[PDB]
């Protein structure tokens, strides 16, 4: 008959279009249930909710009947019936939603049960749209402040947690692309927001916990950063016994703040957590950081990853260290196009800054470093004189300077792949609904000659005796007058490839056997 | 601590909380070794002494407990016993709280078979298995020999109770679709796949239970899933659910033809006439399932028009023949209804009996020194 | 962070604590490149809490010597956050606290081809 959109014919106003026979019995039957039940009992009281709901203005006497307090029994009427209460308060525009905004100075658990409730089952409404679940959460943007009870040093840790939560099950519902810059009722709750980044009464594994909504969106938030970042780790980590509560929450928020900036890409996040890690080696899980790197060089904009890399590369000017952790990771992974983008950025950027004094070396290996894998995909006008620069650098005849060495050698390396080409280089339905509840949840030996043997294999795909400088290897190696550090390079590398030179190792056995003769740091048994 | 607590919640209550909210992080920290059932018994214990919790913790430990269920496998036997006792006793102490119970037993029950259903069939952080739970669920539902000792300082029929409502949601929850594209292709096997996982697990836990604790159900729960059924006339895990619901019924003795009782006899017989003409149709694995139900049967219900029921009985034989388990059910069921109904019923069709009874007729490391063999630490059709 | 904790140590076992001092040194220490001027704050306000702390119990000639070489440590640490802020925020204790008198003296005594290339080509 209601679907036929009649209830007065069979049951007319009898004081008010309130029909309370309906909810008389509702609330002497689910309070008389502990003073018994029954699965037909309760689709029998799910039915009679339906009938209520069949009825108008109801839904205020439900509001105030989940605030009985027999001893607790109006929550307890809403946790019997909470699928039918949510599937009737979705209708309730925002009358109920003002009732609470209004009684909830006091009520606390029951308020916030409730508010999850209307959450979820929006949530779960999306078959047709979620854009009541998103009227819904504009309505409470604008209530927010009705209701002050929460969220600050008015309420314990317990009830700031708690709006945390349903603040945060609010962002997962609703579109961050509105109430995420200034959107009407957005600074209401924004300020509020920053507020409770701001209580270091809470836990830092709570906060960050809180936190890790940053992906939804200035000087506010770096600076909240910081001084919240600050106050956790002094210098180091691994300081902290691993495995000790307060390194396992150190790691906690660590790796909360990597995922979290890791889809938000925020460059000044990148910034402070590079820093925060170019401090000691491998003390903030240096192999996450890299992988994320990783993962965020294939993803966002060109433009974005141009504009952040820019923002790290000017935040370089240890110094050196800052751009060694981090760069190269996005250099090696990032989309090519944004590489073209940025390094044509940089072009006379790098040109004059090519040509105390250790600073200056730290920035020139940086530079090299750089500049080599830049080349690494394709070949402005300028770009053909800046080969030299390079070459000359490690031509000089305090280990920082043979750093250095190795940095403009491995430059050239690079760089020599496509010019000097020839020979001649100048040495579910399941699924959904398993999501939806995690959802309701919240919660679910010495290395520095590889490129060289890099180039070796690639001059062997471009192409007995050779000025490949096999035959000046050759005689290098040959005599044993070279220097011991020197053999262990060119033997540790001709290790790597010997294929290349097979009509050439009818001569090798000569240099090598001398090399073998008497043999004599890290282990000379290893390479023997 | 855990078991300290209690005696902690004599002198400084307020600080015996206080330690439980540090163990949440751990567990948290433990989120993401085998170490989880000292977690669960630690938590049972001081729940049981804690009466006032932060209620942030009731979505936490909802995903807290289903991981051990997903750590379950590659465990040792031992601690196995171990996590499932933390289980118990967890379950235990948050029966205190009628409101809290329910709904976190639920949740949590529907998430973990959520996850068992999510492990997918064969067809022809080590690997895990899905077969390995049930051993689990005999204990869940076999745990007398523990709540005893907590109530030292029933409830498995609660357990049996809420499982029964857990899959009676999950039943309703999931539906299934298909197309042809006599002919079959399913749009979700995913979802086909959960769903005979389902099946795989519960008829056997089911059974081995007391039906009298499903009793609440007989008339209601079958019904829908004969309402199921009705859905998909085509499903093998129908068949089989619905077989062991009679067998069920057949151990509480259910037949003595309450409306309830006589509306489920009608609809019994209704559908049992339907299939076992509908079984033309049906193939291997399809029609197995059919002719199983068919014995499933009790002789109550089956009394009318014993004549639509021997044909596929015949088939039930003389498939049993190539399927031994199918021919020894049908048997059962046989010597039962003869036990049962009289021989002059059943005279007419003694002559198409007994020719489908001419089947299993016509046929015919390890050294003397003493190791304490671990083969021995290792532990038809002739029938 | 280990602030408190020498603070702690030093108001619970009463000693000079060489490890105090090797923590506060760690703590001042890793400000070069990483402009970390709040945690410089934090940094120079441990140093107080500290410098009362050893003039309280029995550190007093102790962290007279320890901030008085740290000052002029700071001093030859030629920055771009330097002991200009030590001072300019020190404007109470930069220096040795005994008494009276030396103390305050020293308080008063602190608080107020290529290179051919260059110097002549351009000179």
């Keep these: 008959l209601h679907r036929a959109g009649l209830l007065h014919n069979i049951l007319p106003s009898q004081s008010t279009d309130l029909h309370h026979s309906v909810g008389t019995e509702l609330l002497s039957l689910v309070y008389k249930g502990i003073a018994s039940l029954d699965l037909s009992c309760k689709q029998l009281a799910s039915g009679l909710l339906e009938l209520a709901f069949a009825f108008g203005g109801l839904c205020e006497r439900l509001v105030s009947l989940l605030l009985n307090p027999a001893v607790s029994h109006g929550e307890y009427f809403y946790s019997l019936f909470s699928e039918t209460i949510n599937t009737e308060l979705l209708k309730n525009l925002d009358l109920a939603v003002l009732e609470l905004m209004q009684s909830s100075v006091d009520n606390t658990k029951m308020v916030s049960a409730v508010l999850n409730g209307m959450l979820d089952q929006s949530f779960r409404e999306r078959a047709n749209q979620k854009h009541q679940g998103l009227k819904l959460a504009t309505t409470i943007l604008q209530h927010w402040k009705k209701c002050d009870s929460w969220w600050a040093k008015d309420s314990p840790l317990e009830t700031k947690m708690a709006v945390l939560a349903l603040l945060a099950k609010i962002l997962q519902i609703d579109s961050s692309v509105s109430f995420n810059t200034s959107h009407g009722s957005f600074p209401e709750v924004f300020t509020t927001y920053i507020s409770l980044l701001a209580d270091t009464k809470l836990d830092l594994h709570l906060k960050g916990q809180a936190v890790t909504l940053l992906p939804f969106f200035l000087?506010?938030?770096?600076?909240?950063?910081?001084?919240?970042?600050?106050?956790?780790?002094?210098?180091?980590?691994?300081?902290?016994?691993?495995?000790?509560?307060?390194?396992?929450?150190?790691?906690?928020?660590?790796?909360?703040?990597?995922?979290?900036?890791?889809?938000?890409?925020?460059?000044?996040?990148?910034?402070?957590?590079?820093?925060?890690?170019?401090?000691?080696?491998?003390?903030?899980?240096?192999?996450?950081?890299?992988?994320?790197?990783?993962?965020?060089?294939?993803?966002?904009?060109?433009?974005?990853?141009?504009?952040?890399?820019?923002?790290?590369?000017?935040?370089?000017?240890?110094?050196?260290?800052?751009?060694?952790?981090?760069?190269?990771?996005?250099?090696?992974?990032?989309?090519?196009?944004?590489?073209?983008?940025?390094?044509?950025?940089?072009?006379?950027?790098?040109?004059?800054?090519?040509?105390?004094?250790?600073?200056?070396?730290?920035?020139?290996?940086?530079?090299?470093?750089?500049?080599?894998?830049?080349?690494?995909?394709?070949?402005?006008?300028?770009?053909?004189?800046?080969?030299?620069?390079?070459?000359?650098?490690?031509?000089?005849?305090?280990?920082?300077?043979?750093?250095?060495?190795?940095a403009a050698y491995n430059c050239a390396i690079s760089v020599i792949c496509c010019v000097f080409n020839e020979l001649k280089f100048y040495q579910s339905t399941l699924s959904e609904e398993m999501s939806q509840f995690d959802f309701s949840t919240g919660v679910q030996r010495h290395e520095c000659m590889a490129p060289l043997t890099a180039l070796v294999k690639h001059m062997h795909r471009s192409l007995r005796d050779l000025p490949s400088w096999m035959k000046f290897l050759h005689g290098k190696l040959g005599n044993p007058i070279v220097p011991l550090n020197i053999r262990l390079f060119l033997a540790k590398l001709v290790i790597n490839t010997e294929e290349v030179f097979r009509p050439y190792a009818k001569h090798w056995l000569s240099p090598l056997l001398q090399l073998a003769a008497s043999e004599n740091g890290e282990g000379i048994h290893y390479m023997v | 601590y855990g078991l300290f607590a209690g005696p902690c919640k004599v002198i400084n209550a307020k600080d015996v909380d206080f330690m439980y909210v540090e163990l949440i992080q751990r567990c948290k920290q433990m989120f993401l070794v085998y170490?989880?059932?000292?977690?669960?018994?630690?938590?049972?214990?001081?729940?049981?002494?804690?009466?006032?919790?932060?209620?942030?913790?009731?979505?936490?430990?909802?995903?807290?407990?289903?991981?051990?269920?997903?750590?379950?496998?590659?465990?040792?036997?031992?601690?196995?016993?171990?996590?499932?006792?933390?289980?118990?006793?967890?379950?235990?102490?948050?029966?205190?709280?009628?409101?809290?119970?329910?709904?976190?037993?639920?949740?949590?029950?529907?998430?973990?078979?959520?996850?068992?259903?999510?492990?997918?069939?064969?067809?022809?952080?080590?690997?895990?298995?899905?077969?390995?739970?049930?051993?689990?669920?005999?204990?869940?539902?076999?745990?007398?020999?523990?709540?005893?000792?907590?109530?030292?300082?029933?409830?498995?029929?609660?357990?049996?109770?809420?499982?029964?409502?857990?899959?009676?949601?999950?039943?309703?929850?999931?539906?299934?679709?298909?197309?042809?594209?006599?002919?079959?292709?399913?749009?979700?096997?995913?979802?086909?796949?959960?769903?005979?996982?389902?099946?795989?697990?519960?008829?056997?836990?089911?059974?081995?239970?007391?039906?009298?604790?499903?009793?609440?159900?007989?008339?209601?729960?079958?019904?829908?899933?004969?309402?199921?059924?009705?859905?998909?006339?085509?499903?093998?895990?129908?068949?089989?659910?619905?077989?062991?619901?009679?067998?069920?019924?057949?151990?509480?003795?259910?037949?003595?033809?309450?409306?309830?009782?006589?509306?489920?006899?009608?609809?019994?017989?209704?559908?049992?006439?339907?299939?076992?003409?509908?079984?033309?149709?049906?193939?291997?694995?399809?029609?197995?399932?059919?002719?199983?139900?068919?014995?499933?049967?009790?002789?109550?219900?089956?009394?009318?028009?014993?004549?639509?029921?021997?044909?596929?009985?015949?088939?039930?034989?003389?498939?049993?023949?190539?399927?031994?388990?199918?021919?020894?059910?049908?048997?059962?069921?046989?010597?039962?209804?003869?036990?049962?109904?009289?021989?002059?019923?059943?005279?007419?069709?003694?002559?198409?009996?007994?020719?489908?009874?001419?089947?299993?007729?016509?046929?015919?490391?390890?050294?003397?020194?003493?190791?304490?063999?671990?083969?021995?630490?290792?532990?038809?059709?002739?029938? | 962070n280990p602030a408190e904790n020498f603070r702690v140590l030093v108001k619970q076992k009463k000693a000079s604590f060489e490890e105090a001092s090797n923590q506060l040194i760690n703590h001042i220490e890793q400000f070069l490149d990483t402009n970390e001027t709040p945690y410089f704050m934090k940094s120079i306000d441990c140093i107080r809490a500290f410098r009362e702390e050893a003039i309280k119990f029995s550190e007093e000639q102790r962290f007279n010597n320890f901030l008085k070489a740290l000052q002029e440590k700071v001093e030859i640490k030629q920055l771009n956050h330097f002991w200009e802020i030590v001072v300019q925020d020190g404007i109470t204790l930069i220096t040795k606290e005994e008494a009276s008198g030396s103390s305050v003296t020293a308080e008063e005594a602190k608080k107020f081809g290529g290179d051919v290339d260059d110097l002549l080509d351009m000179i």
């Design chain 2, 35 to 383: 170490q989880m059932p000292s977690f669960l018994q630690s938590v049972a214990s001081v729940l049981l002494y804690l009466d006032t919790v932060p209620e942030v913790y009731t979505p936490v430990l909802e995903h807290l407990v289903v991981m051990q269920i997903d750590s379950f496998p590659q465990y040792s036997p031992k601690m196995q016993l171990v996590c499932c006792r933390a289980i118990v006793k967890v379950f235990l102490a948050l029966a205190a709280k009628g409101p809290v119970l329910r709904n976190c037993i639920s949740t949590v029950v529907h998430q973990g078979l959520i996850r068992i259903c999510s492990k997918p069939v064969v067809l022809p952080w080590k690997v895990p298995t899905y077969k390995d739970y049930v051993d689990l669920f005999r204990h869940l539902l076999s745990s007398d020999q523990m709540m005893d000792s907590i109530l030292a300082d029933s409830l498995n029929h609660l357990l049996y109770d809420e499982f029964v409502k857990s899959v009676l949601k999950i039943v309703e929850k999931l539906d299934l679709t298909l197309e042809i594209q006599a002919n079959l292709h399913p749009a979700k096997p995913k979802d086909f796949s959960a769903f005979i996982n389902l099946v795989e697990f519960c008829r056997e836990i089911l059974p081995e239970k007391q039906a009298e604790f499903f009793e609440p159900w007989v008339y209601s729960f079958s019904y829908e899933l004969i309402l199921q059924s009705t859905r998909l006339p085509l499903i093998s895990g129908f068949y089989k659910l619905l077989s062991i619901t009679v067998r069920n019924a057949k151990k509480i003795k259910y037949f003595e033809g309450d409306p309830e009782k006589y509306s489920c006899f009608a609809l019994f017989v209704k559908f049992g006439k339907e299939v076992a003409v509908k079984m033309k149709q049906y193939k291997d694995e399809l029609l197995a399932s059919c002719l199983t139900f068919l014995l499933s049967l009790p002789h109550n219900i089956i009394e009318l028009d014993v004549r639509a029921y021997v044909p596929a009985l015949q088939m039930a034989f003389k498939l049993g023949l190539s399927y031994t388990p199918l021919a020894e059910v049908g048997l059962n069921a046989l010597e039962e209804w003869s036990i049962y109904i009289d021989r002059h019923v059943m005279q007419p069709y003694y002559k198409d009996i007994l020719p489908c009874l001419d089947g299993y007729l016509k046929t015919s490391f390890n050294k003397v020194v003493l190791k304490h063999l671990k083969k021995t630490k290792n532990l038809s059709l002739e029938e």
């Design chain 1, 219 to 406: 000087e506010e938030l770096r600076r909240v950063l910081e001084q919240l970042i600050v106050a956790h780790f002094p210098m180091q980590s691994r300081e902290f016994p691993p495995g000790t509560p307060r390194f396992n929450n150190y790691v906690d928020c660590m790796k909360k703040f990597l995922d979290a900036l890791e889809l938000s890409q925020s460059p000044m996040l990148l910034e402070l957590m590079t820093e925060v890690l170019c401090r000691e080696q491998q003390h903030v899980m240096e192999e996450l950081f890299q992988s994320s790197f990783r993962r965020i060089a294939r993803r966002g904009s060109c433009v974005t990853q141009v504009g952040l890399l820019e923002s790290v590369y000017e935040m370089f000017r240890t110094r050196q260290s800052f751009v060694d952790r981090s760069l190269l990771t996005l250099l090696w992974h990032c989309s090519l196009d944004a590489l073209r983008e940025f390094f044509s950025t940089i072009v006379v950027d790098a040109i004059d800054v090519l040509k105390t004094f250790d600073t200056q070396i730290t920035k020139k290996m940086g530079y090299y470093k750089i500049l080599d894998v830049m080349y690494s995909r394709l070949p402005n006008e300028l770009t053909k004189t800046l080969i030299k620069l390079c070459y000359d650098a490690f031509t000089e005849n305090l280990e920082r300077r043979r750093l250095y060495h190795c």
